[PDB]
Amino acid sequence: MIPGGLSEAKPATPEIQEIVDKVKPQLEEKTNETYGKLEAVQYKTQVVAGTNYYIKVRAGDNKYMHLKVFKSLPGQNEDLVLTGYQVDKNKDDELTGF
Fold this sequence. Notes:
The protein is α+β, with helices and mostly antiparallel strands. One of its GO terms (biological process) is cell-cell adhesion. It is found in: Cytoplasm. This is Cystatin-A.
């Protein structure tokens, strides 16, 4: 029905890859490097004042990049955010909380 709180990793989808595909550029200048297609692989979602996001996304090459976005409900203007990301994080890195 409505499982809130960091749950297991739901396998990414077009929406998961959208969060990352929406913060991939926010990641380029928010870290100090340039990432590439973020082929989402899995993503942890939870609830609070909207819905945060966790996403183990393939950073193009064999490298990976964890992602942490926040959902600020539907309100036009800007939407979602890149609340964090574990750069250079490999697959073994389960998202767990973040």
